[PDB]
Design a protein around this nucleic acid. Structure first.
Ligand SMILES: [Zn+2]
Length: 96
DNA sequence: TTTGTAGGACTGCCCTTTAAT
DNA sequence: AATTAAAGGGCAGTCCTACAA
């Protein structure tokens, strides 16, 4: 049997693995909901990590891995970090 | 039988902006 | 002006499941 893309697939295969739509309603887990257990599991394994979208910062010399560390260190809200980094009154900038 | 797959369904952690003080 | 709690918007890592192999 031949697949819509042209390659030969098993008579039972609805499409080659390469043509298989897995987006939206086509995903095998589409419209499903996760249990409180699964949620809890995921939760535990994500604890301790840092997202890829952090920004190294330098507080007039003292550098941190992310704004949150800068905030937790100075003991301020994360929004105030943003404020200062933009204020001309502070020497706070995000590192390359 | 078993395995691989990819995106849906989620998470922690993150950054910014807004309201309200 | 200075500050913060929430709401807005993000990202890769985890789980989960039907289907090709
Ligand atoms: Zn195909």
């Amino acid at each position: 049997k031949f697949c819509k893309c042209g390659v030969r697939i098993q008579t039972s295969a609805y499409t080659c693995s390469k043509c298989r739509n897995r987006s939206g309603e086509n995903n095998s887990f589409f419209n499903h909901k996760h249990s409180d257990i699964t949620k809890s599991k995921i939760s535990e394994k994500m604890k301790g990590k840092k997202p890829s979208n952090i920004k190294k910062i330098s507080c007039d010399g003292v550098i941190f891995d992310c704004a949150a560390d800068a905030a937790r260190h100075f003991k301020i809200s994360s929004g105030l970090v943003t404020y200062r980094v933009k204020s001309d009154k502070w020497n706070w900038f995000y590192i390359n």
